[PDB]
């Protein structure tokens, strides 16, 4: 009952990954309330050309204008499940497409993609099959939970600075000027709901989207979306090389799955200011490591992910929303499976199960 993760096992040709299409969206407001619309979407608004360059003081507003989301509340798939409930009769494909699909969060798939190269943080994924559909929901590991409650001040401030960068680069209205005098409230989120397919595995997943570029060439989502990122300033080829090997892998995996074509990075100096920007097209990120003996390979990422979905599908035989197959993985080891029922691992809520049953 095990799945190996070594990169050399997955080194063949790039598998088929269907162009993702956006089926819908939803927003979570400042009170973490769900709305089935795009009210939370912000608009890409980078520093005006022929004006002063970026000069963003991410160290502005922390912590008195910071309203961090309560991470103790474990929402699991609940918001995505509400979207599915409100769109189940109106999904594309045809009869029984949902019954053949795997439903999860984009970030869960990102963790699968990076697993062959990940050497720091393990994970756990709870799986339940219900009306044919395979649902995947991450479980916080004991080490992750302990790390979270013991987050050092530096890490808490670094997390704020990543969200603060968005406030310098986005506006509430197209063409608007970004307003950093306000609050960073990380309850607020705009999520895109996407359909794709990896190999023979249809996928339905949602992902948080940083902003929309109204000047983007392609007007149809997800091609108009932009991912915003921060990273430390780099000054030597060796620093850039380490960035290419480790960070860009994570950025690629996150933006490749939903079809977000550009990541815009602000580089922060040690005093907390962003004074330079650079755009990384998702489809060109691998070029930085293609001829690197210590690089990553997107074919390995996707072939492993396909192998895991096959492994999970074959492992979860029983159609039962109270039954959970927990997939556990630590760096260097295989993915292992354990079986559980009801609390605490069961994650499909009665309100979803009963509505789908009726
Ligand atoms: N797994 C994680 N652990 C701790 N902080 C995280 C995190 N994922 C995201 N963050 C914070 O959320 C911000 C927005 O995420 P995202 O870039 O994916 O849109 C991140 O900014 P950065 O990505 O610039 O570090 C980071 O500050
Ligand atoms: Mg984001
Ligand atoms: Mg971002």
Swiss-Prot record:
State its location(s). Nucleus
Tell me the GO molecular function terms.
5'-3' exonuclease activity; magnesium ion binding; mRNA 5'-diphosphatase activity; mRNA binding; nucleotide binding; RNA NAD+-cap (NAD+-forming) hydrolase activity
- Report residues binding substrate: 32, 75, 105-107, 191, 208, 229, 254
Q: Which domain of life is it from?
A: Eukaryota
Q: Where does Mg(2+) 1 bind?
A: 166, 210, 227-228
State how the cofactor is bound: Binds 2 magnesium ions.
Q: Where is the signal peptide?
A: none
* Inhibition and activation profile: The 5'-3' exoribonuclease activity is inhibited by adenosine 3',5'-bisphosphate.
Catalyses:
a 5'-end triphospho-ribonucleoside in mRNA + H2O = a 5'-end phospho-ribonucleoside in mRNA + diphosphate + H(+); a 5'-end NAD(+)-phospho-ribonucleoside in mRNA + H2O = a 5'-end phospho-ribonucleoside in mRNA + NAD(+) + H(+); a 5'-end NAD(+)-phospho-ribonucleoside in snoRNA + H2O = a 5'-end phospho-ribonucleoside in snoRNA + NAD(+) + H(+); a 5'-end (N(7)-methyl 5'-triphosphoguanosine)-ribonucleoside-ribonucleotide in mRNA + H2O = a (N(7)-methyl 5'-triphosphoguanosine)-nucleoside + a 5'-end phospho-ribonucleoside in mRNA + H(+)
Pfam families associated with the record: RAI1
Q: Can you supply a Gene Ontology BP term from the record?
A: NAD-cap decapping
Keywords in alphabetical order, please: Exonuclease, Hydrolase, Magnesium, Metal-binding, Nuclease, Nucleotide-binding, Nucleus, Phosphoprotein, RNA-binding
Q: State where Mg(2+) 2 binds.
A: 166, 208, 210
Cellular component GO terms held in the UniProt record: nucleus
User: Binding residues for adenosine 3',5'-bisphosphate, per the UniProt record?
Assistant: 159, 210, 254
Residue ranges, annotated region (Adenosine 3',5'-bisphosphate) = 227-230
Q: Which family does it belong to?
A: Belongs to the DXO/Dom3Z family.
Protein name, entry field: Decapping and exoribonuclease protein
Give the originating organism. Mus musculus (Mouse)
This protein's gene is called Dxo
